[PDB]
Amino acid sequence: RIVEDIADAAVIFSEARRRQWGPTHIARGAALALIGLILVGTGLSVAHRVITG
Amino acid sequence: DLLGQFIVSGIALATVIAALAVRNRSAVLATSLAVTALVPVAAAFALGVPGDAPNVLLAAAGVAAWSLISMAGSPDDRGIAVFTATAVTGVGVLLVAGAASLWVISSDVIGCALVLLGLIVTVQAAQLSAMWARFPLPVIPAPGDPTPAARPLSVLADLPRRVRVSQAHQTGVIAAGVLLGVAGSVALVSSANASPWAWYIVVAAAAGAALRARVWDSAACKAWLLGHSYLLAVALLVAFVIGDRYQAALWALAALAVLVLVWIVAALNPKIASPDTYSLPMRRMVGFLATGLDASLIPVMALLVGLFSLV
Amino acid sequence: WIVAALNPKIASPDTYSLPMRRMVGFLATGLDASLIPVMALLVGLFSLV
Amino acid sequence: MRTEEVDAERADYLRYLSVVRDNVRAHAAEQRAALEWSHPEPEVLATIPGTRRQWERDPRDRDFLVLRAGRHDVPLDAALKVKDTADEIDLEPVAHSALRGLLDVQRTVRDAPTGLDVAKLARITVIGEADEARAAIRAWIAQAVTWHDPTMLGVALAA
Amino acid sequence: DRRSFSSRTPVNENPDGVQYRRGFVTRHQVSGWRFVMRRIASGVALHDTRMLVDPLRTQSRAVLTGALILVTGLVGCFIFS
Amino acid sequence: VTRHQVSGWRFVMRRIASGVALHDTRMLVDPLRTQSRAVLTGALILVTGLVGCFIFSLF
Amino acid sequence: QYPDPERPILRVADGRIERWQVWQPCVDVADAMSAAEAAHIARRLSRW
């Protein structure tokens, strides 16, 4: 296709993106947050001992 | 000794030329080499400056130059957000480091400068991208008779490439925005038992980020935005432990726990992350709130840095 | 003068933005506007009243 | 009466324009669909002599004795007429610019199956290299004979 | 009513019909440019350009208001001395 | 003399000026006018701060 | 004498069929057939 109105020419040629936020990126966000939390708590106590008592 | 710098210089020059040489055949190895090429260059142009900051300045200039000259000489993509973000953050840190090096700085003005630069770049992110994409600028005519020519079909056949490049640039710009928006906000509160206006500033900037993420639509951009509070929390945590305090660290963990709790209760509950099920007045109030936050930011920043006190 | 002599795209006001050549207007309005009160300072008229 | 209102009106007109562009693109889709249906590429015609579409061309149909030769820009037979009634009144710049930039690129279909009709030619004379000619000749002559009843049109040769 | 004269412009068909070369951005042109660049810049962040509510300009004018109130308080306490 | 009669006069004796320095009489936008009020207002900022500082000693 | 649209003149370029008017390519990608292809066409069609 050929479009000249740059407004549509951007709101049309950016749909090869599956960009929909939707209720599925929320899952990976929650999961990786949880994983980081667990690891950082453990490593926090790790360094807490490798540097103090 | 010096040999630690001769090695860096040689490796970095070799990588520069090799990444400039394989562009034509691979176009995929080329960009990986280009990305890794800016870790040694900054080492050589900073440690190469003898001293302790009067040295980060040249490193920032080097990464900015390398990023800029590699992004332009590139195909459609893979010059992804990584390059533009390095470029913007290098330019900002160079601007701030010059003032820090040639003059004296309270080591708090630094935090003010960085949070300001981050807020500025984030707020004016889109326009800057549309600039860097080099769109076909409008042709607004006078009410006389300079009846202009229609755009040739060539530039209209080249447009889908520019659109993707625009999306990429704007993601990268937001990335560097949050990256600096935390790179200062951590150098602020962590120093040694500072003023509560710093507390309100960091929480205001975090809420301003997390409230901007209702604007954009590219998922990666929204993720970068929402993640600023999280990255801030973890950076404070490690700066505390290395700061040798061991008291509010567990408080940072408490905060991070609330963050992941709200994340979870939002995750398996597709009735709170749904803007439709809410009310119009609440939408309007959230908007007014997001306006009020970043409105209030700059005056309270000036108060905190103390320029109402010089006068 | 030289870089604008042998390079006929900097001395043609058509190839700039619309809002960039806009502000140059503001700049050229402020500069001559401030010029009279600044003279009052230098001459030291304010040290008489 | 300051810039806000005129900008609102600008935005409204541009939205209307987007709608019209979508509609005319649908019309162009119909047109290219039909023209591809009735003059397929000179390889599919190997499969046509079998199925029930071989003598599917009749003297009442809009495509009759039309011989395809290639692809180029067909001018979109639909109308696209605006009802301009002004005596050189000055129209808003940022709207008129958009409409003008529309009425020139969405008026001609992109590469579409052309038509070398022979119902009103009575003589064709090609010029140029030997077999490049006999190519297009054999091409449209087969495309002609394949669609129309052998009891309706005749061909003659001398070589 | 007041019998207004809507702006008009015909042709020329003579010698003085292609001699002016005067580049001067009129108010309308700068308004139009502002609007176009704020309808593109809202087509790569919102992914719809019906332009009913623009929050980007809202953000930018908010930070501007912060700056202006900053300078206002600055001088209003500079007069304090 | 109504204002329309004077609102007219200053307009024609500006359309003439744009005539001989700008070489176009469309008068869509005229920097010469800006040139006038700019240097003009820098006189006012003087005269007011003149008054505002004369009154400053009046405490 | 400005050839009539009927009984016209046609020149065959590499992929053009350029009409004769005063060069108005009139086709930008031409449809060309091969000999053996037409042979197989005739063969198939002689059946019904």
Curated annotation (Swiss-Prot), chain B:
Keyword Disulfide bond: no
Keyword field: Cell inner membrane, Cell membrane, Membrane, Transmembrane, Transmembrane helix, Transport
Record's subcellular location: Cell inner membrane
Membrane topology recorded in Swiss-Prot or TrEMBL: Multi-pass membrane protein
Interval of the full protein contained in this chain: 160 to 472 of 475
Phenotype caused by lack of the gene: Deletion of the gene impairs iron-bound mycobactin utilization and EsxG and EsxH export.
Gene, per the UniProt record: eccD3
Role according to the record: Part of the ESX-3 specialized secretion system, which is required for siderophore-mediated iron acquisition and for the secretion of EsxH and EsxG.
Record's subunit section: Part of the ESX-3 / type VII secretion system (T7SS), which is composed of cytosolic and membrane components. The ESX-3 membrane complex is composed of EccB3, EccC3, EccD3 and EccE3.
GO annotations of cellular component type: plasma membrane
Species: Mycolicibacterium smegmatis (strain ATCC 700084 / mc(2)155) (Mycobacterium smegmatis)
Similarity remark: Belongs to the EccD/Snm4 family.
Coiled coil residues, start to end: none
Name listed for the protein in its UniProt record: ESX-3 secretion system protein EccD3
Transmembrane segments: 2-22, 27-47, 53-71, 80-100, 103-123, 172-192, 193-213, 223-243, 248-268, 292-311
From Swiss-Prot, chain E:
Subcellular location: Cell inner membrane
Chain ranges passing through the membrane: 63-81
Region called Disordered, residue ranges: 1-18
Quaternary structure, from the entry: Part of the ESX-3 / type VII secretion system (T7SS), which is composed of cytosolic and membrane components. The ESX-3 membrane complex is composed of EccB3, EccC3, EccD3 and EccE3.
Function: An ATPase. Part of the ESX-3 specialized secretion system, which is required for siderophore-mediated iron acquisition and for the secretion of EsxH and EsxG.
UniProt family annotation: Belongs to the EccB family.
Protein name as it appears in the record: ESX-3 secretion system ATPase EccB3
UniProt source species: Mycolicibacterium smegmatis (strain ATCC 700084 / mc(2)155)
Highest classification ranks of the organism: Bacteria, Bacillati, Actinomycetota, Actinomycetes, Mycobacteriales
Gene that specifies this protein: eccB3
From Swiss-Prot, chain F:
Subcellular localization(s) per the UniProt record: Cell inner membrane
Disulfide bonds: none
Transmembrane domains' residue ranges: 39-59
Chain's role: An ATPase. Part of the ESX-3 specialized secretion system, which is required for siderophore-mediated iron acquisition and for the secretion of EsxH and EsxG.
Family statement: Belongs to the EccB family.
Oligomeric and partner information: Part of the ESX-3 / type VII secretion system (T7SS), which is composed of cytosolic and membrane components. The ESX-3 membrane complex is composed of EccB3, EccC3, EccD3 and EccE3.
Name assigned to this protein: ESX-3 secretion system ATPase EccB3
Underlying gene: eccB3
Section of the entire sequence shown: 33 to 91 of 518
From Swiss-Prot, chain G:
Phenotype upon loss of function: Deletion of the gene impairs iron-bound mycobactin utilization and EsxG and EsxH export.
Localization of this protein: Cell inner membrane
Domain of life of the native organism: Bacteria
Coiled-coil blocks: none
UniProt subunit comment: Part of the ESX-3 / type VII secretion system (T7SS), which is composed of cytosolic and membrane components. The ESX-3 membrane complex is composed of EccB3, EccC3, EccD3 and EccE3.
Functional note: Part of the ESX-3 specialized secretion system, which is required for siderophore-mediated iron acquisition and for the secretion of EsxH and EsxG.
Name assigned to this protein: ESX-3 secretion system protein EccC3
